């Protein structure tokens, strides 16, 4: 159920080579809160910005949720070559997302010979393990 303490979800960004603004995935519910993948072009040299967002649309300023997660960019040719980084963060209204502005080089992810991009699509994945939130379901 949505109360699950962990989950793995993916989001495929299309027309990736042409990305110019931040894109958000639909929500995946964990601990009954909406978690989303956020991707955007950055420049450390261009790089892929990859963040995990939590409960960002809520007007509440009383909530908080500590979570650990594995942010991964899927390599469709070989799963063992997927690029991953781990995070640990206390999510709350003032810091509702966390990740890396320079997750990996843009030139690498968009290289047709590396295996991360196909038909200009790149798939992002997040495995999140969150603790029970505070200031939500009193």
């Amino acid at each position: 159920t949505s109360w699950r303490s962990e989950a793995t979800f993916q989001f495929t960004v299309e027309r990736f080579s042409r990305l110019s603004e931040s894109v958000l995935s639909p929500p995946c519910f964990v601990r009954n809160l909406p978690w989303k993948i956020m991707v955007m072009p950055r420049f450390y040299q261009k790089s892929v910005g990859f963040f995990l967002q939590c409960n960002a649309e809520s007007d509440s300023t009383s909530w908080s949720c500590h979570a650990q997660a594995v942010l991964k960019i899927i390599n469709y040719r070989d799963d063992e070559k997927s690029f991953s980084r781990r995070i640990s963060h206390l999510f709350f209204h003032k810091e509702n997302d966390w990740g890396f502005s320079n997750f990996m080089a843009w030139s690498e992810v968009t290289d047709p010979e590396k295996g991360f991009i196909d038909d200009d699509k790149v798939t992002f994945e997040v495995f999140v393990q969150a603790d029970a939130p505070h200031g939500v379901a009193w």
């Binding site: 955007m40 810091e95 509702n96 997302d97 966390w98 990740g99 890396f100």
Partner: peptide, 7 residues
């Protein structure tokens, strides 16, 4: 290299 918010 280092994590942060998207801000």
């Amino acid at each position: 290299v280092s994590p942060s918010t998207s801000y």
